[PDB]
């Protein structure tokens, strides 16, 4: 459960992503695939080499989904319902993989926005990503 302070922290930090949406999304995916090779098993249909067109395109979709989550932070189950059906019902993604991607997202943000990535904001981002993760792994 996110605090009011968590919600404002996430808004200000994620808002700084802006035009860098696809870029940071693609980088987080690349970090996940290289750091945690078993996650590649969900993408056998992808070219997963550095700079791949498919990973770029997908990174943008992931990052835009999180942007949509931030915009609907108080109504995430409703806003992410189709994405929950995709991940939980169709893809059956092991919840461990959300932890790995969420970690790689935090790493990406820290590498890129060191001013934003204070300990308090790190904490709020981690809670935010865990909540998005719970939504996408549940079916309700």
């Amino acid at each position: 459960v996110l605090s009011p302070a968590d919600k404002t922290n996430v808004k200000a930090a994620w808002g700084k992503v802006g035009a860098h949406a696809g870029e940071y999304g693609a980088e987080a995916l690349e970090r996940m695939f290289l750091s945690f090779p078993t996650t590649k098993t969900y993408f056998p249909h992808f070219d997963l080499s550095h700079g791949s067109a498919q990973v770029k395109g997908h990174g943008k979709k992931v990052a835009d989904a999180l942007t949509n989550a931030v915009a609907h932070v108080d109504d995430m189950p409703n806003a992410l319902s189709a994405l929950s059906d995709l991940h939980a019902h169709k893809l059956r993604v092991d919840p461990v993989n959300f932890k790995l991607l969420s970690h790689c997202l935090l790493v990406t943000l820290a590498a890129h926005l060191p001013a934003e990535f204070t300990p308090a904001v790190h904490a709020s981002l981690d809670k935010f990503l865990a909540s998005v993760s719970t939504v996408l792994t549940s079916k309700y």
């Binding site: 980088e27 690349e30 970090r31 290289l34 750091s35 945690f36 970690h103 790689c104 935090l106 790493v107 990406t108 820290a110 590498a111 890129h112 060191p114 990535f117 204070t118 300990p119 308090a120 790190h122 904490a123 981690d126």
Partner: protein, 143 residues
């Protein structure tokens, strides 16, 4: 289980690490991001705000010791299970630290390295460090 290319990448970055700061930063973030971990460090006094935590001298001192142990591992990658043999006995028997917390600290350290190094903390560099921190956490959990 690190490859020579991974060992070289890990070693090169670690040479540039501020040894008096990074450990305190990682421990401080552990206590802020995962506040239940504060339970193990009540002797530290005030840990009641992120600012109180990050500026606590006991956090800074203990984190230096923590960092020193990672440096040990980094100079002995092929034998982490003996490099951390004593420390493993401490955290399980006396301290009763649930193992999930070792992995959390390793990942918080990765976050700190990314924060400090920015673009230099490349995806392959991270991958190598993920093996290191999993190695350390495994080795520490051995008892």
């Amino acid at each position: 289980h690190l490859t020579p290319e991974e060992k070289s990448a890990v070693t090169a970055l670690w040479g540039k690490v501020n040894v008096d700061e990074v450990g305190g930063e990682a421990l401080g973030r552990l206590l802020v991001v995962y506040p239940w971990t504060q339970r193990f460090f009540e002797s530290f006094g005030d840990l009641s705000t992120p600012d109180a935590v990050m500026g606590n001298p006991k956090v800074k001192a203990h984190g230096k010791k923590v960092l020193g142990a990672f440096s040990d591992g980094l100079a002995h990658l092929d034998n982490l299970k003996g490099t951390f043999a004593t420390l493993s006995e401490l955290h399980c028997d006396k301290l009763h630290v649930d193992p999930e917390n070792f992995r959390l600290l390793g990942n918080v350290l990765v976050c700190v390295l990314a924060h400090h190094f920015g673009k230099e903390f490349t995806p392959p560099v991270q991958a190598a460090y993920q093996k290191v921190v999993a190695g350390v956490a495994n080795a520490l959990a051995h008892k």
